Amino acid sequence: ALLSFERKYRVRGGTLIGGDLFDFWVGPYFVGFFGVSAIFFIFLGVSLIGYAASQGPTWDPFAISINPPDLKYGLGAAPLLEGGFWQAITVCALGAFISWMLREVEISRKLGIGWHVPLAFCVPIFMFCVLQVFRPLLLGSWGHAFPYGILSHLDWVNNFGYQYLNWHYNPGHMSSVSFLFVNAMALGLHGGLILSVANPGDGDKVKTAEHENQYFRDVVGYSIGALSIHRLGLFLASNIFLTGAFGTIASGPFWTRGWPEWWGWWLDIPFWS
Amino acid sequence: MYHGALAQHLDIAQLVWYAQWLVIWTVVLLYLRREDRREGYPLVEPEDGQVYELPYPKTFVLPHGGTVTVPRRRPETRELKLAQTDGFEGAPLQPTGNPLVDAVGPASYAERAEVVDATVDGKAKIVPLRVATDFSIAEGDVDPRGLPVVAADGVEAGTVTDLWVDRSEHYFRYLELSVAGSARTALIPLGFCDVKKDKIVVTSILSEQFANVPRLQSRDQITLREEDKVSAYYAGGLLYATPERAESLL
Amino acid sequence: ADYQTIYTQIQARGPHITVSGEWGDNDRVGKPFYSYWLGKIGDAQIGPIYLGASGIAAFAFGSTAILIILFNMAAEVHFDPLQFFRQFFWLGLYPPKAQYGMGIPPLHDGGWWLMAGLFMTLSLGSWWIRVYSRARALGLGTHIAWNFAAAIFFVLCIGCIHPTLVGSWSEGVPFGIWPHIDWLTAFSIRYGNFYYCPWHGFSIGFAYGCGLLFAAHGATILAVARFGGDREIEQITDRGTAVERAALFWRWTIGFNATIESVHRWGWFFSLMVMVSASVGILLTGTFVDNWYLWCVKHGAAPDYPAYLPATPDPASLPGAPK
Amino acid sequence: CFEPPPATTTQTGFRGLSMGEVLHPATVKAKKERDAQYPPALAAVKAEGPPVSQVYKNVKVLGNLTEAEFLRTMTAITEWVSPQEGCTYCHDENNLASEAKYPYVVARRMLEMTRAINTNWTQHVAQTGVTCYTCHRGTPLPPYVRYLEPTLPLNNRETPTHVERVETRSGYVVRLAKYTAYSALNYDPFTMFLANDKRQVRVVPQTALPLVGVSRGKERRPLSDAYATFALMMSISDSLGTNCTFCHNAQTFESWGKKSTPQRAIAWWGIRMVRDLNMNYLAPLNASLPASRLGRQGEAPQADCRTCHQGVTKPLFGASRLKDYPELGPIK
Numbered sequence A: 001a002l003l004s005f006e007r008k009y010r011v012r013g014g015t016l017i018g019g020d021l022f023d024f025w026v027g028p029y030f031v032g033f034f035g036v037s038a039i040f041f042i043f044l045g046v047s048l049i050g051y052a053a054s055q056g057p058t059w060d061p062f063a064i065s066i067n068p069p070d071l072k073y074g075l076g077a078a079p080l081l082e083g084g085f086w087q088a089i090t091v092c093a094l095g096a097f098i099s100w101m102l103r104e105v106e107i108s109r110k111l112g113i114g115w116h117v118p119l120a121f122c123v124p125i126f127m128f129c130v131l132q133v134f135r136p137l138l139l140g141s142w143g144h145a146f147p148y149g150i151l152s153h154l155d156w157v158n159n160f161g162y163q164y165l166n167w168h169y170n171p172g173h174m175s176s177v178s179f180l181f182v183n184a185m186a187l188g189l190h191g192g193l194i195l196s197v198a199n200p201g202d203g204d205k206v207k208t209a210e211h212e213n214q215y216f217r218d219v220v221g222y223s224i225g226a227l228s229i230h231r232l233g234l235f236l237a238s239n240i241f242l243t244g245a246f247g248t249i250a251s252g253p254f255w256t257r258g259w260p261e262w263w264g265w266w267l268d269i270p271f272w273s
Numbered sequence B: 001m002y003h004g005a006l007a008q009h010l011d012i013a014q015l016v017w018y019a020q021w022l023v024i025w026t027v028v029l030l031y032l033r034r035e036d037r038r039e040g041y042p043l044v045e046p047e048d049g050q051v052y053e054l055p056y057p058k059t060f061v062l063p064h065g066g067t068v069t070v071p072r073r074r075p076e077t078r079e080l081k082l083a084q085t086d087g088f089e090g091a092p093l094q095p096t097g098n099p100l101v102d103a104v105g106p107a108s109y110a111e112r113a114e115v116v117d118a119t120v121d122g123k124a125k126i127v128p129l130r131v132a133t134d135f136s137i138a139e140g141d142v143d144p145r146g147l148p149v150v151a152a153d154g155v156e157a158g159t160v161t162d163l164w165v166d167r168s169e170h171y172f173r174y175l176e177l178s179v180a181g182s183a184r185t186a187l188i189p190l191g192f193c194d195v196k197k198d199k200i201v202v203t204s205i206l207s208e209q210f211a212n213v214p215r216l217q218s219r220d221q222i223t224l225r226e227e228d229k230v231s232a233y234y235a236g237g238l239l240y241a242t243p244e245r246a247e248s249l250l
Numbered sequence C: 001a002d003y004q005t006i007y008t009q010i011q012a013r014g015p016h017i018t019v020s021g022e023w024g025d026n027d028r029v030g031k032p033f034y035s036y037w038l039g040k041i042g043d044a045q046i047g048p049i050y051l052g053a054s055g056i057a058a059f060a061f062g063s064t065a066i067l068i069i070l071f072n073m074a075a076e077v078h079f080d081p082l083q084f085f086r087q088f089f090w091l092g093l094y095p096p097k098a099q100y101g102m103g104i105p106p107l108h109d110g111g112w113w114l115m116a117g118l119f120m121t122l123s124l125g126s127w128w129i130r131v132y133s134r135a136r137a138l139g140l141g142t143h144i145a146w147n148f149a150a151a152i153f154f155v156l157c158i159g160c161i162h163p164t165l166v167g168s169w170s171e172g173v174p175f176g177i178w179p180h181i182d183w184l185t186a187f188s189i190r191y192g193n194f195y196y197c198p199w200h201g202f203s204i205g206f207a208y209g210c211g212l213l214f215a216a217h218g219a220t221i222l223a224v225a226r227f228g229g230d231r232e233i234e235q236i237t238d239r240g241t242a243v244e245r246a247a248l249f250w251r252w253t254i255g256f257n258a259t260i261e262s263v264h265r266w267g268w269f270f271s272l273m274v275m276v277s278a279s280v281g282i283l284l285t286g287t288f289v290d291n292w293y294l295w296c297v298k299h300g301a302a303p304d305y306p307a308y309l310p311a312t313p314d315p316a317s318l319p320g321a322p323k
Numbered sequence D: 001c002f003e004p005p006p007a008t009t010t011q012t013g014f015r016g017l018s019m020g021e022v023l024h025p026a027t028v029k030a031k032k033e034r035d036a037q038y039p040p041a042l043a044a045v046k047a048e049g050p051p052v053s054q055v056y057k058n059v060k061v062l063g064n065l066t067e068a069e070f071l072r073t074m075t076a077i078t079e080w081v082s083p084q085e086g087c088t089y090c091h092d093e094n095n096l097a098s099e100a101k102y103p104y105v106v107a108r109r110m111l112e113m114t115r116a117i118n119t120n121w122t123q124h125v126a127q128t129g130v131t132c133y134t135c136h137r138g139t140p141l142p143p144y145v146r147y148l149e150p151t152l153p154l155n156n157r158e159t160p161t162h163v164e165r166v167e168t169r170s171g172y173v174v175r176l177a178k179y180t181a182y183s184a185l186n187y188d189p190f191t192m193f194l195a196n197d198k199r200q201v202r203v204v205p206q207t208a209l210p211l212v213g214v215s216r217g218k219e220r221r222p223l224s225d226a227y228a229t230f231a232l233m234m235s236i237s238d239s240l241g242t243n244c245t246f247c248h249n250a251q252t253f254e255s256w257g258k259k260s261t262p263q264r265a266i267a268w269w270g271i272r273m274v275r276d277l278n279m280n281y282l283a284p285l286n287a288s289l290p291a292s293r294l295g296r297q298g299e300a301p302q303a304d305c306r307t308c309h310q311g312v313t314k315p316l317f318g319a320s321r322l323k324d325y326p327e328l329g330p331i332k
């Protein structure tokens, strides 16, 4: 039921809303007011997805697709089987994600720790809003948003990119991809370094903070340090979406041509043309 | 004929799809989720499932002598000054006394070893600059020695007298201060200090609460369990420095 | 707020530390110097660096690959320096455009590309020996070298193993900023849409999962920096309240948790599986699957949609249509 | 650096697929104003008198027209092709039957080509059709033509820089890139796919698994073919002022039915039309043109999609003079 060190931490308090009313656990899970609102939005959103899918052509989990309205509906409500289920599921998704984030703040407060995790989780919630709310608002129709389907959301990403001929030349995408790659590489370096110090092999002794810093000073001439690699990892991962969002919002509202042609700002300077 | 086609209208990539999921779930469930249980298990409330979920014990050979084996049984028989708020199994507990001094909730410390953390060459790692005389403050940064520590109520709680530096990582981790009116020295983690040019602001506890900050056994060294006791006391004030702090923020 | 998690308010300075390795102590070169502004968000000390045979070989082999590519790029602008600087992102060294199969192509249609790939591979292998041997020299496990090996193996898959399996050097990745990007689309088009390759999906799930885990783990350690959670080696050998609280934050949020050691195994495994999943998908592509979309249609997975504008019969198949 | 909102967007596929046009209102307005320069149809004339096959001495294509109908055609041709130069661009002013000026015999072949487009390629031009203006836009040299190597500027009415000039070897990669929507694709899709019918644009397998006998070694098309088809598609997209989803659901570029729009089939007919125009009407004109008109391999200038479309999905936004000049086709 409890970890061997857990009981002393299970004290009352730390909520943002509700106080003692929902301040309790169900098995390992903390509830709180935002645990109750998270379960409400998750139950509604999954129920709406299940009923929308029951009216479509397939029960295959890869092929099911619940889609937004035609562009002609603009920012208005659409009939349920013509975009309205998608609209209601999107509101439940945002409610569930924000409830999840604020519940993490209550859990952090009860434990006396920093709120850095819920703050970091605001980044993917923000990117979901860029894709489903802010860009569609700027273009004037909910129908520019992505559909809910395991493979169909990929068909939307695919066509969206090719609407700008070659999306790889989008400068916001180049930044986003570069952060995705250096973050995945850095996480392998960090996980591998900590494991290599704690697990030298062959009954050898566990090594030290000094050995950690010596390894990368030897391999690349610099060690960022044990606290700082965690600040760097949060920074690299967060900037996947914090820079990518600029590339997503620019496409349509601030640029309608192919992305390769955008680089004419450099290529077409009269001096070297 | 087609490359990859097999009997029964199977093909090779289709088989590798099921194989990849088998590899992923075997590594995630049988290896990683068991590595996740090297601390805190068995749970408290001998079932077969309590044995199946654990990995075989591993032993760390420590750099300065001795070994540590995990998982191992670690009952916490330390008396907790906490009472149930309700009969429900998931009901929260409430402090029966001063939760900062009793060290419960966010004021809890872990039963770490009463051992001084060591440098790679075996010297005390975390030490005051009056001992670490080859260490210094970088040019450009505030020297906090002599500055007042101002607590969450805006009252001066004491005067900073030294900084404790991590000699292995070249990084300050505590300030040491004389506590006003209490005839004692106290450490505070630098993460609880807002370092300004004319004062150190500490919003985690009130001025009066500096009198009961955990005391070190020795003057110029600190053990791993003492570092936990000192850090946990200020963290406890985030929830307990006033009765208002435990209640709904909004 | 914990301002230490944003930047170092008061920086410390002390004598530089050197940990002796089993060999190579005399191949460290440089006098370390200190950046005060770097010291706000990282260690202020820069240098010294280890030289050694493996790293010198990597630089010799890699500089040769880089000069072969740059000379061929310079030939593409007829050695005009201003146009080289202007057009640089568009310039490339390409694999064979003609189909020679596995035949060694002429220098002017793929041969210089093959030589640049050979010297890059030797450079990657020599750097791997450095990454592996520096760990052994300092008494550390070789976990970083095995993650690095999966990344090198993926590069070998798209550079020469897939070309060898289908029997054509024309399929290799070009050297150049835009040209290596153009290959991504040529390859996805040729093999029927890489969104429909399950191993592209696995690699992306692990790559996004590395974003999730490093955001989550980096923020978790900053959230417990007041308890010394960044001193992860001694939190592993002697659990402190930093990692008790980190574990309970996740247990109370998602219903389960890791240890401070095992979260680094999760991160190491997710990073490794980006490259392992990507390599498996490239090894299957062209060898055993020609069109990933039609393979997903064959196995019943691909979504289908109603027409919006009228359905459009292939005009090439109409009665009387020209070729 | 950027284009201010709002953007005009259309839908060309099922909702939720991000398929449709994305257009900048100021660019659409500027193109409509340029295309609106298309001269109005000349006043109709009643057919009266004998056919000009009886009245004039050297009429081989328009002989069934009466004199007033035929002189109306010559006035329209002058408006469309040589309005600044006038009738004497093609004619000896003292003998209108003389073929001594080279533009006369080229114009007669162009009258045959234009009537062939409107009679034999209605699968592409429909009942909108083409006139001399569709390509020429009021100058003897059409503004958008192609040689057997890439040339800049795309619009030959703009003065080239030294590096744009085809003789300057250092500018080659930019001449290639500005023909494929600024991509780095190292292929000229005009000479590969539109000058003749030697190559297949399709490169994607039509089966899930690789067929044994076409999937190993020299049996295979080289991956260069897929880059080259991508270059053609970037060029077609930029030539029509549109993007891939005007014609394809990118889920499967290779599929037709619900995965392609009706415009993709019209585009397919356009590739066959352009190959016919170039192989059978335009390329053979190098024997009739002056050396100053020819590219560096002796080639005559030839047509691509941009020659008529000039950045718009229908040339001149669908403007037509087909009913006004039935002598340009379709011919019964």
Ligand code: BCB
Pocket (backbone or CB within 6 Å): A097, A124, A125, A127, A128, A131, A157, A158, A159, A160, A161, A162, A166, A167, A168, A170, A172, A173, A176, A177, A180, A240, A241, A243, A244, A245, A246, A247, A248, C184
């Ligand atoms: C042909 C079209 C292409 C395309 C089209 C494309 C578009 C149109 C966009 C990207 C974007 C992005 N692309 Mg690109 N792309 C990328 C990489 C990237 C990503 C780094 C980046 C951001 C993805 C994102 O927004 O996630 C979003 C993820 C979110 C919002 C997750 C939210 C999580 C949520 C808060 C919580 C969910 C909880 C679950 C429901 C709960 C489940 C319950 C269970 C678990 C208990 C690579 C590495 C490549 C390569 C190697 O070729 C590539 C090629 C391509 N992209 C093609 C060129 N891509 C985006 C970008 O930033 O562009 C600049 C973008 O808009």
Ligand code: BCB
Pocket (backbone or CB within 6 Å): A046, A049, A128, A131, A146, A150, A151, A153, A154, A157, C195, C200, C201, C202, C204, C205, C206, C208, C209, C212
């Ligand atoms: C701008 C570009 C985007 C993009 C591009 C993209 C690509 C190109 C690919 C995915 C893939 C994936 N995407 Mg998608 N995506 C997904 C979910 C997913 C999964 C189906 C799959 C694995 C992702 C993963 O492991 O992440 C890391 C997170 C981990 C490891 C934690 C576990 C997450 C869990 C697997 C998610 C499960 C979601 C549920 C299936 C759906 C919700 C269930 C509800 C009803 C309870 C969500 C929930 C969202 C939201 C909420 O916005 C999102 C948005 C976007 N994706 C953007 C539109 N994504 C890959 C795939 O295989 O698709 C079939 C793939 O190739």
Ligand code: BCB
Pocket (backbone or CB within 6 Å): A157, A181, C061, C062, C063, C065, C066, C120, C123, C124, C151, C152, C154, C155, C158, C183, C184, C185, C187, C188, C193, C194, C195, C197, C199, C200, C203, C204, C207, C274, C277, C278, C279, C280, C281, C282
């Ligand atoms: C239109 C075409 C597309 C495409 C084409 C594509 C291809 C062709 C491939 C991927 C692959 C992959 N794609 Mg996909 N893709 C991805 C994401 C991913 C990556 C997770 C993954 C692995 C590649 C990688 O990590 O390289 C980064 C890491 C690398 C390259 C390892 C380098 C390590 C090396 C040791 C570094 C050495 C550097 C040297 C020092 C440099 C010096 C050299 C000198 C000497 C010359 C996303 C998130 C999206 C979205 C959101 O749309 C997307 C869409 C698209 N991809 C489109 C469908 N993608 C790969 C895959 O998984 O295939 C199954 C792959 O082959």
Ligand SMILES: C/C=C1/c2cc3[nH]c4c(c3C)C(=O)[C@H](C(=O)OC)c4c3nc(cc4[nH]c(cc(n2)[C@@H]1C)c(C(C)=O)c4C)[C@@H](C)[C@@H]3CCC(=O)OC/C=C(\C)CCC[C@H](C)CCC[C@H](C)CCCC(C)C
Pocket (backbone or CB within 6 Å): A038, A041, A042, A043, A044, A045, A046, A089, A092, A093, A096, A097, A100, A104, A117, A118, A120, A121, A123, A124, A147, A148, A149, A150, A151, A153, A237, A238, A239, A240, A241, C208, C209, C210, C211, C212, C215, C216, C219, C253, C254
């Ligand atoms: C740049 C920084 C990033 C980042 C960071 C962090 N990420 C976090 C955290 C942090 C810090 C947490 O703290 C939090 C967590 O607890 O971790 C264990 C979390 C979480 N990251 C999830 C998924 C995830 N992270 C992704 C990406 C990034 N993460 C990037 C890289 C991606 C993709 C695809 O990229 C995915 C899919 C969940 C596992 C979890 C949310 C649980 C939830 O919200 O519960 C509440 C909601 C539910 C349990 C289900 C709600 C169902 C709705 C109502 C109905 C479905 C609607 C839906 C729109 C349909 C989509 C269909 C689909 C096919 C298209």
Ligand SMILES: CC(C)=CCC/C(C)=C/CC/C(C)=C\CC/C(C)=C/CC/C(C)=C/CC/C(C)=C/CC/C(C)=C/CC/C(C)=C/CC/C(C)=C/CC1=C(C)C(=O)c2ccccc2C1=O
Pocket (backbone or CB within 6 Å): A026, A029, A030, A031, A035, A036, A038, A039, A042, A043, A046, A047, C212, C213, C216, C217, C218, C220, C221, C243, C246, C247, C250, C251, C253, C254, C255, C256, C257, C258, C259, C260, C263, C266
């Ligand atoms: C019809 C329907 C759907 C409606 C019903 C809805 C329903 C489920 C409600 C049931 C009601 C319940 C049970 C009670 C209510 C209470 C409540 C709010 C329950 C929540 C239930 C709920 C929605 C559960 C979902 C939980 C969830 C989102 C899990 C996702 C897990 C995933 C995929 C995580 C991805 C990241 C991942 C790979 C992590 C693995 C590694 C881990 C554990 C890292 C965490 C971690 C890190 C990062 C450290 O740095 C660290 C450092 C030092 C020590 C420990 C750790 C540590 O544990």
Ligand code: HEC
Pocket (backbone or CB within 6 Å): D055, D056, D057, D058, D059, D060, D061, D062, D063, D071, D074, D075, D077, D078, D081, D082, D086, D087, D088, D089, D090, D091, D096, D097, D103, D104, D105, D107, D108
């Ligand atoms: C080239 C673009 C031309 C311009 C400009 C003008 N004309 Fe023309 N003309 C041209 C051709 C190709 C032909 C032969 C048509 C055929 O069916 O073979 C002609 C013919 C004439 C004639 C008949 C001469 C004769 O055989 O007796 C006349 C009288 C004539 N054209 C008149 C004319 C006028 C008045 C023009 C300016 C308005 C003019 N032409 C321009 C090609 C071209």
Ligand code: HEC
Pocket (backbone or CB within 6 Å): D077, D081, D090, D103, D104, D106, D107, D108, D110, D111, D112, D114, D130, D131, D132, D133, D134, D135, D136, D140, D141, D142, D145, D277, D282, D289, D293, D300, D301, D302, D303, D307, D308
């Ligand atoms: C696009 C399919 C065209 C149509 C419709 C018409 N013309 Fe054309 N013309 C076209 C090209 C590609 C070229 C070669 C480039 C060149 O300028 O030589 C031409 C050429 C001519 C010329 C000669 C111009 C010159 O070299 O001085 C003439 C006189 C001409 N074309 C006349 C003409 C007429 C009368 C047309 C309507 C019947 C007509 N052209 C249509 C492309 C296209």
Ligand code: HEC
Pocket (backbone or CB within 6 Å): A162, A165, C189, D201, D202, D203, D204, D205, D229, D230, D233, D234, D236, D237, D240, D242, D243, D244, D245, D246, D247, D248, D253, D254, D255, D263, D264, D265, D267, D268, D271
């Ligand atoms: C209509 C004007 C189109 C635009 C816009 C795009 N494409 Fe296209 N595509 C079109 C046709 C008529 C054809 C068939 C050509 C033939 O002679 O058969 C194609 C073909 C492709 C292919 C190959 C499909 C196959 O079966 O192998 C690909 C991969 C392709 N097109 C991609 C593509 C891209 C990336 C586009 C935007 C840059 C694009 N097309 C636009 C018609 C049209």
Ligand code: HEC
Pocket (backbone or CB within 6 Å): D117, D124, D125, D126, D128, D129, D130, D134, D236, D240, D263, D264, D266, D267, D268, D270, D271, D274, D303, D304, D305, D306, D307, D308, D309, D313, D314, D315, D317, D318, D319
């Ligand atoms: C002049 C001889 C043309 C050339 C060369 C090309 N096209 Fe064309 N196109 C032309 C006409 C007169 C029309 C009809 C316009 C109308 O009002 O209906 C078209 C039409 C198309 C379309 C359809 C656009 C739509 O219906 O919205 C497409 C997709 C198209 N053309 C494509 C296309 C391509 C790819 C070409 C180069 C291979 C091309 N056209 C050349 C005239 C001419």
Ligand SMILES: CC(C)=CCC/C(C)=C/C=C/C(C)=C/C=C/C(C)=C/C=C\C=C(C)\C=C\C=C(/C)CC/C=C(/C)CCCC(C)C
Pocket (backbone or CB within 6 Å): C066, C069, C070, C114, C116, C117, C118, C120, C121, C155, C156, C158, C159, C160, C172, C173, C174, C175, C176, C177, C180
């Ligand atoms: C029979 C056998 C034994 C012989 C086969 C030979 C062999 C092993 C061949 C292997 C070939 C391989 C692995 C080829 C792989 C090629 C790949 C993956 C190329 C990918 C990307 C390349 C890029 C982006 C190159 C960019 C190059 C430049 C901008 C010019 C070089 C200049 C630099 C400063 C290099 C820095 C690299 C980058 C950070 C910009």
Ligand SMILES: COC1=C(OC)C(=O)C(CC=C(C)C)=C(C)C1=O
Pocket (backbone or CB within 6 Å): A186, A189, A190, A191, A193, A194, A212, A213, A216, A220, A222, A223, A224, A225, A226, A227, A229
């Ligand atoms: C254990 O902490 C770590 C460091 O500090 C000791 C590093 O320098 C590095 C190396 C990082 C850089 C930017 C040199 C990593 C990966 C790390 O995990």
Ligand SMILES: COC1=C(OC)C(=O)C(CC=C(C)C)=C(C)C1=O
Pocket (backbone or CB within 6 Å): A266, C084, C085, C086, C087, C088, C089
């Ligand atoms: C000569 O090399 C180049 C640069 O370096 C000065 C650039 O900044 C740029 C512009 C790119 C950025 C990110 C400013 C290009 C295109 C380039 O080719």
Ligand SMILES: CCCCCCCCCCCC[N+](C)(C)[O-]
Pocket (backbone or CB within 6 Å): B041, B042, B051, B052, B053, B054, B055, B056, B057, B071, B072, B073
């Ligand atoms: C009380 C916890 C410490 C006791 C030592 C750990 C128990 C041994 C677990 C053996 C089971 C291992 N495994 C993988 C076979 O399940």
Ligand SMILES: CCCCCCCCCCCC[N+](C)(C)[O-]
Pocket (backbone or CB within 6 Å): C053, C054, C057, C121, C122, C123, C124, C125, C126, C129, C133
């Ligand atoms: C894959 C390319 C291999 C080329 C060899 C490069 C030089 C290797 C140097 C080996 C050094 C051995 N050492 C010092 C680690 O023991």
Ligand SMILES: CCCCCCCCCCCC[N+](C)(C)[O-]
Pocket (backbone or CB within 6 Å): A060, A061, A062, B017, C195, C196, C197, C198, C199, C200, C201, C202, C296, C299, C300, C301
């Ligand atoms: C990233 C692409 C993912 C596509 C996965 C396709 C899996 C095909 C094989 C299993 C399909 C099972 N089925 C029929 C229930 O869909």
Ligand SMILES: CCCCCCCCCCCC[N+](C)(C)[O-]
Pocket (backbone or CB within 6 Å): B024, B028, B029, B033, C201, C202, C205, C206, C209, C256
């Ligand atoms: C596509 C990438 C797949 C990554 C695997 C998913 C990792 C999350 C597994 C959590 C399982 C939790 N639990 C308690 C059931 O074991």
